[PDB]
Design a protein around this nucleic acid. Structure first.
Lengths: 55, 101, 97, 160, 74, 126
RNA sequence: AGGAGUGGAGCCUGCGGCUUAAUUUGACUCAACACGGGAAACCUCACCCGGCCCGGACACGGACAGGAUUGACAGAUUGAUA
RNA sequence: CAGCCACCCGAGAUUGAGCAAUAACAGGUCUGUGAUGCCCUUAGAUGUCCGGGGCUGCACGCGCGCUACACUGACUGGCUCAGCGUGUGCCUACCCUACGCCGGCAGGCGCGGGUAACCCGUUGAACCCCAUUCGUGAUGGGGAUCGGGGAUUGCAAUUAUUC
C-alpha cells in the first residue's frame, strides 16, 4: 500500500531534500537572502550572483 | 490620483543615474511637473565566507558585499505618458517597480 | 515497473506535446513539476528516461541537480511508433512560433 | 506578490548562473562563449555570443526551439513567450572561455598539450592581444603532476 | 563500499516465484451443465470489477485489495 | 514494610479519574499531543497490547511484543504487563511496575557504548 | 617600556590513549586542536545495526502469455493497517 | 640631494582593507562537488521509499576561550544615548512583530503595520550616570554542583538538551 503511503512523514525542518541547490552536497548551507548553496558553489559562482569584493 | 511612482533599483550607480537622467529628460521633453530623484539608502549586503573548502590553514575569509542603489521618481502624470517615455531601451540590470495610487 | 503501460504511453503523449522538458533529481518526490497531480511519479520519470538511455536514442545535459532531456529523430520516431499514432502531433511551439 | 530588492537581485543572479552553467556544459562543443539577458515589457530576450554560431543555432532554428523548450520548463517561462538570439564573437582574443573550450576540445580529440597551447598562443598574439597565460596542470605524461605555463607577452598581475 | 556480511539468515531480496497450471479457473466453475452461474463469489461494488474479477472469502475476515471493502461473515 | 504510592492514587484511580486533575498529576509530558492530535499509522499498537493482555498464561509472563516504533502513550493501561522494547539490534524484556506511570516508554531504552578498554601505552608518551 | 592575560579556577564539536557491539573521523611544529563555517529526536549518521525496496533498465537466449503491485479493526504478531 | 625631525594654518600633515609578482610545494581537502584512476563494489546497492541507538562514553598533561576571586565593586532603582544590519516564502508552517482579555515563565484570537528610511524605530533600549540591606565573608563577589511545575515554534527533548 505504498502508493497511498508514500511520503507519509513530512520532513519540513530538515534540509536533506532542501540542500545546496547545485549538487548532492551539504555541510555548510547558508540561507542568507535564500541562497540555498554551500560555500563551495557560492564562492566559485559569486561572480554571477552580483557579490563583489571591495571591502 | 495620477501620481505615478517609479521605484527603480540597480546594482550600478552610474547606470542608475543615466536611467534617471534619461527618464527625467523624457519627462522634461513633455509638459509634466516632476520631483527630483529621491535616493533611498543603498542596501549593503554582507556575506563573509570561509575560503578554504575544507578547514585548514589560517582563518581566511572573503567578504562579498552587494550594493543595491534605489531611486524613486514620482511624477504628476498618467502612467501612459510615463510608459511612452519608457520605451527607450532601459539599461540592463535596472529594475522598475510601478506604483499607482 | 509494477506500473501500467497505459500510463507510460500517457507520459509519451505528454512529452510529445513538446520536444524536451526537465526533470527534478529526486526519487521521493510524489508528483511531477510539469505533470502536477496526474499520478506520474518522478522516480518513474527518470526510469523512463534511463530506459531510453539504455536504448540509445535519448541523452541528457544534467545540471544543478536537474536532468535535461534530449531527443533525436530516431527517438522521436520510436515514440511516435509506440504511441500507435500519426506523426501529425508536432510540438505546439511551432504552432506558436 | 512583490519581493525585496536583495532577494530579487539574488534570484536574478541565481538564474544567470544557472543559464551560464547549463549552456557551458551543453554547448561547449558548439563553442558557446557567453549569455546576456535583456527585458522588454512582458518579454525576456537572451542573446548568446558563440564562436560557432552556425553550430549554436542549428538547422531552421530547430535546436533553438529545442533550447527554449528546455529553459521554459526549468525557470518558469510560459510556453511560446521566450526567444533565443546569438551573435558571433567579435574576436576570440577578448574572451578567455572561448580559447578555454577550444583547448578542451582540442585535447579531448587527442593531441599533444604543447601543440595546442602554442597554437592558442600564436592565435592570441596574431589577434593584437597584449598578453596570454595558459597554465596547464595535471599529468601530461607518466604518473606525476607537473604544472606547465605557456606565457607570452607582458601581463598585469595585481591591482584594480 | 565494504561487505555487510549477509551470512546468518537468508541473504535474499528476490521476489516470489511460483509454479501452477496454465488453465487456472477460480472465477468460474466448469463441468456444471449450466449456462448460468450460481453466485458464490461476492458482489464487488467497485467500478473496477467486471465478470472476470471477483474475490474469495475465507473464514477469517473478508479479503480485499482493490477498493478496501468488507463482506464479513466470521 | 516500606510504603510506596503514586501521590494518593493508583492505576485504578487514574483510570477512574478524568484527565482534568490528571494534567495536575502530569509532570509536563504527553499533554500537547491532545491539542496537536494523533496522526495515521497509530491505531494498531494499542490493539496489539490489549489483545496480548487479554490472554495471560498461568504462572507465565505476558507474551513478548516486538515493537519497532516509539509510540507515545496517553493512558496507564500498559501497567500490569510486560513489554519487549527496542535496544538497537535485539528486543529487551521489561517488567512494568508503578514507575511506568509518570514516565514515558522510550525512557526505558538506554543504549550507549564505549569503544574498548585501554591505557596510555607505548604509542602515547607526552 | 609596557598593555585583557589566556597559563592559575568546577562547566566546550573536537583532539590522546580512556567501563556492556557504534562515542568512533580528516587535519602532530605555529601555518591541525571554537578548524572542516560542527550545541545532532529525526536527514547533524563517516559509525555493530533491527533491514522496511530495487529508484537491476535494458542488446541476445526463458517453464517463452499467467512472475506482481495498490491485501487497513482480524487468528495473521520479527512494521503490526507492506 | 633623496630624504628625516620640529612649527603655524588646516577638517585632514601615516584613516582601514580587497586586489598582491616570477616560480613552487609531493602542506589539507577524493568525508565540498552530476570534475575524476586497475582492487572490495559484478545488484550481496556503508544513508538511499520507511527510518525506532552512533563523534550524546571517565582517572589526568599548560589546545582558541567562559564567568570570577571583589568595596574603581555584584548589588532595590532613579534617570535615560546607539550603529551595520536581519525581516510573510520555489515540495518554505516557520519572518519581524504596534493593543483588549488572561496568563510572573513561553503564549490563544482579533482589528492589521511591513517589501520594505513607509511597520515596529526615535533599535525610548542595551555599558555607565551609584538614593537598598552590603564591610572581608561561604550570606548578597563565586547558580558552580538538588526535585518538582507552566509549556511555544518540535509526531519523536530519554544526558530537567534549548523558554
Amino acid at each position: 500500500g505504498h502508493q497511498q503511503l508514500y511520503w507519509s512523514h513530512p520532513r519540513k525542518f530538515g534540509q536533506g531534500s532542501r540542500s545546496c541547490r547545485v549538487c548532492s552536497n551539504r555541510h555548510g548551507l547558508i540561507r542568507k537572502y535564500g541562497l540555498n548553496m554551500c560555500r563551495q558553489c557560492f564562492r566559485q559562482y559569486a561572480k554571477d550572483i552580483g557579490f563583489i569584493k571591495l571591502d | 490620483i495620477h501620481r505615478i511612482r517609479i521605484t527603480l533599483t540597480s546594482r550600478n550607480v552610474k547606470s542608475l543615474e543615466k536611467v534617471c537622467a534619461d527618464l527625467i529628460r523624457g519627462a522634461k521633453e513633455k509638459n509634466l511637473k516632476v520631483k527630483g530623484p529621491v535616493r533611498m539608502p543603498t542596501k549593503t549586503l554582507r556575506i563573509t565566507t570561509r575560503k578554504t573548502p575544507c578547514g585548514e590553514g589560517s582563518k581566511t575569509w572573503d567578504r562579498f558585499q552587494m550594493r543595491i542603489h534605489k531611486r524613486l521618481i514620482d511624477l504628476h502624470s498618467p502612467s501612459e505618458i510615463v510608459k511612452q517615455i519608457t520605451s527607450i531601451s532601459i539599461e540592463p540590470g535596472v529594475e522598475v517597480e510601478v506604483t499607482i495610487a | 515497473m509494477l506500473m501500467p503501460k497505459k500510463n507510460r504511453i500517457a507520459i509519451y503523449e505528454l512529452l510529445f506535446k513538446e520536444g524536451v522538458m526537465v526533470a527534478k533529481k529526486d526519487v521521493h518526490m510524489p508528483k511531477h513539476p510539469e505533470l502536477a497531480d496526474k499520478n506520474v511519479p518522478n522516480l518513474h520519470v527518470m526510469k523512463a528516461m534511463q530506459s531510453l538511455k539504455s536504448r540509445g536514442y535519448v541523452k541528457e545535459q544534467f545540471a544543478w541537480r536537474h536532468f535535461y532531456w534530449y531527443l533525436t529523430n530516431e527517438g522521436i520516431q520510436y515514440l511516435r511508433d509506440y504511441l500507435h499514432l500519426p506523426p501529425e502531433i508536432v510540438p505546439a511551439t511551432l504552432r506558436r512560433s | 506578490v512583490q519581493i525585496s530588492k536583495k532577494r530579487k537581485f539574488v534570484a536574478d543572479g541565481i538564474f544567470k548562473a544557472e543559464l551560464n552553467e547549463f549552456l557551458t556544459r551543453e554547448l561547449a562543443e558548439d563553442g558557446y562563449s557567453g549569455v546576456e539577458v535583456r527585458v522588454t515589457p512582458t518579454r525576456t530576450e537572451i542573446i548568446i555570443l558563440a564562436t560557432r554560431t552556425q553550430n549554436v543555432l542549428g538547422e531552421k532554428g530547430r535546436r533553438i526551439r529545442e533550447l527554449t523548450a528546455v529553459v521554459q520548463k526549468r525557470f518558469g517561462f510560459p510556453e511560446g513567450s521566450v526567444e533565443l538570439y546569438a551573435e558571433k564573437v567579435a574576436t576570440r582574443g577578448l574572451c578567455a572561455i572561448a580559447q578555454a573550450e577550444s583547448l578542451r576540445y582540442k585535447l579531448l580529440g587527442g593531441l599533444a598539450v604543447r601543440r595546442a597551447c602554442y597554437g592558442v598562443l600564436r592565435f592570441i598574439m596574431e589577434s593584437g592581444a597584449k598578453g596570454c597565460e595558459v597554465v596547464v596542470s595535471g599529468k601530461l605524461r607518466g604518473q606525476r603532476a607537473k604544472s606547465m605555463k605557456f606565457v607570452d607577452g607582458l601581463m598585469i598581475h595585481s591591482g584594480d | 563500499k565494504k561487505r555487510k556480511k549477509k551470512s546468518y539468515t537468508t541473504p535474499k531480496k528476490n521476489k516470489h516465484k511460483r509454479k501452477k497450471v496454465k488453465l487456472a479457473v477460480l472465477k468460474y466453475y466448469k463441468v456444471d451443465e449450466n449456462g448460468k452461474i450460481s453466485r458464490l463469489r461476492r458482489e464487488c461494488p467497485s467500478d473496477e470489477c467486471g465478470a472476470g474479477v471477483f474475490m474469495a472469502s475465507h473464514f477469517d475476515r473478508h479479503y480485499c485489495g482493490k477498493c478496501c471493502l468488507t463482506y464479513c461473515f466470521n | 514494610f516500606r510504603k510506596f504510592t503514586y501521590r494518593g492514587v493508583d492505576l485504578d484511580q487514574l483510570l477512574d479519574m478524568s484527565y482534568e486533575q490528571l494534567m495536575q498529576l502530569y509532570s509536563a509530558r504527553q499533554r500537547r499531543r491532545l491539542n496537536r492530535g494523533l496522526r495515521r499509522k497509530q491505531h494498531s499498537l494499542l490493539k496489539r497490547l490489549r489483545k496480548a493482555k487479554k490472554e495471560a498464561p498461568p504462572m507465565e509472563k505476558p507474551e513478548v511484543v516486538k515493537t519497532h516504533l516509539r509510540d507515545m502513550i496517553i493512558l496507564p493501561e500498559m501497567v500490569g504487563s510486560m513489554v519487549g522494547v527496542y535496544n538497537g539490534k535485539t528486543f529487551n524484556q521489561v517488567e512494568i511496575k508503578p514507575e511506568m506511570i509518570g514516565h514515558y516508554l522510550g525512557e526505558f531504552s538506554i543504549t550507549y557504548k564505549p569503544v574498548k578498554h585501554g591505557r596510555p601505552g607505548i604509542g602515547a608518551t607526552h
